[PDB]
Design a protein around this ligand. Structure first.
Ligand SMILES: CC(C)CCC[C@@H](C)[C@H]1CC[C@H]2[C@@H]3CC=C4C[C@@H](O)CC[C@]4(C)[C@H]3CC[C@]12C
Ligand SMILES: CN(C)CCOC1=Cc2ccccc2Sc2ccc(Cl)cc21
Ligand SMILES: [Zn+2]
Length: 370
């Protein structure tokens, strides 16, 4: 029965490993091939996928091997610190990539021309490298104090974080703080997007009012005034996209400057439909931003929820070092770490479920259609 349980646990963990590897390889392929997904957010998501693939290649199979050997470290003792370091490094890179995505998208939408078509690809790669560097800096104390002292990474022959200060500082620096920052940034982001939609409605109101004023105008001065208001409104409502709409308003304005009232009014009549179409397009862009915000919130929520039992049990075990049952806590950790690895695997499934570009790319990759 003991062998039965360890063999089925190892098999389930192997299923989790293969799902992780396949899904994250597919995500890497989709981001590197599909030209629609060439923004900074998808670059960060591919970095996340690479981190998950490294976690499934370097950490999860060694964890399965540890399971097979009754949780006694089979490899040399110096490799336990390296294993814990790689695990912590990849998980910290994941969580801080999510936090960086949140902050970056928020600060981005805080920019009046952030619907422009000029987004720098190189800067995203630089930010990703900086996040990897700060993750390495966060994780380095674990090898530092683990290669010197074997007691902080070993507990009765098993390989796991044993230092209480290590567990506390790690749980705060790599889990709690980014979680709080992400929650706050998420709510601030929904507020900014609401403000964006409100301003868009305001610009549409201005465009409609002045269109009617143009429809019933006597002289060129009235037409020019209404067109000036319209131009400012349309420029603000483009939010940086760079449209023909302001140029067409400038054409009408030029007509009005020449004292040609009837022709300016005809130009405005033409402008009505163009204005409606472009306003609808701008609101669609805002809605797309909202949908991306919700999808990334789903991803962050899944990661946090699926890792929370492990961190809760770890903090609890550090609090009641001898008051609580350590065997049951050991089993709880041995299950919750794999729950967190399942979180590491789940993300490509979400990308498929809620992103049509990813879904079509994956459907074509499964059938080897490149
Ligand atoms: C193309 C873009 C989006 C993805 C780039 C991924 C790069 C920057 C990431 C993915 C895997 C990362 C590596 C993962 C493991 C290690 C070993 C560690 O001891 C030092 C950091 C180092 C070497 C990381 C450096 C940064 C790294 C190479
Ligand atoms: C050997 N393996 C099990 C270590 C993995 O534990 C951790 C995972 C993580 C998961 C998700 C985000 C961040 C981490 S950073 C971390 C920090 C402190 C401790 Cl105590 C654990 C810990
Ligand atoms: Zn926007």
């Amino acid at each position: 029965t003991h062998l039965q349980e360890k063999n089925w646990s190892a098999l389930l963990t192997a299923v989790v490993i293969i799902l992780t590897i396949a899904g994250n390889i597919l995500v890497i392929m989709a981001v590197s091939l599909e030209k629609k997904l060439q923004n900074a957010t998808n670059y960060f998501l591919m970095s996340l996928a690479i981190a998950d693939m490294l976690l499934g290649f370097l950490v999860m199979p060694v964890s399965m091997l540890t399971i097979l050997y009754g949780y006694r470290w089979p490899l040399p003792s110096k490799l336990c610190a390296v294993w814990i370091y790689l695990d912590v490094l990849f998980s910290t890179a994941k969580i801080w990539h999510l936090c960086a995505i949140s902050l970056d998208r928020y600060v981005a939408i805080q920019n009046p021309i952030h619907h422009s078509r000029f987004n720098s690809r190189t800067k995203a790669f630089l930010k990703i490298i900086a996040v990897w560097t700060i993750s390495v800096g966060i994780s380095m104390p674990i090898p530092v104090f683990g290669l010197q002292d074997d007691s902080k990474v070993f507990k009765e022959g098993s390989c796991l974080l044993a230092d209480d200060n290590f567990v506390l500082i790690g749980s705060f620096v790599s889990f709690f703080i980014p979680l709080t920052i992400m929650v706050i940034t998420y709510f601030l982001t929904i507020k900014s997007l609401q403000k964006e939609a409100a301003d868009l409605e305001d610009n549409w109101e201005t465009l409609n009012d002045n269109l009617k004023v143009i429809e019933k105008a006597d002289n060129a001065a009235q037409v020019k005034d209404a067109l000036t208001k319209m131009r400012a409104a349309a420029l603000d409502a483009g939010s940086g996209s760079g449209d023909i709409l302001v140029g067409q308003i400038d054409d009408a304005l030029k007509l009005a400057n020449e004292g040609k009232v009837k022709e300016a009014q005809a130009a405005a009549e033409q402008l009505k439909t163009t204005i409606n179409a472009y306003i609808q397009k701008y609101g669609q862009s805002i809605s797309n931003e909202q949908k991306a915000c919700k999808v990334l919130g789903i991803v962050f929520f899944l990661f946090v929820v699926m890792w929370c039992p492990f961190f809760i049990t770890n903090i609890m075990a550090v609090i009641c070092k001898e008051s609580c049952n350590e065997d049951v806590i050991g089993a709880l950790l041995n299950v919750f770490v794999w729950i967190g690895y399942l979180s590491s695997a789940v993300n490509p499934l979400v990308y498929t479920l809620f992103n049509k570009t990813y879904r079509s790319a994956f459907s074509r990759y499964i059938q080897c259609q490149y």
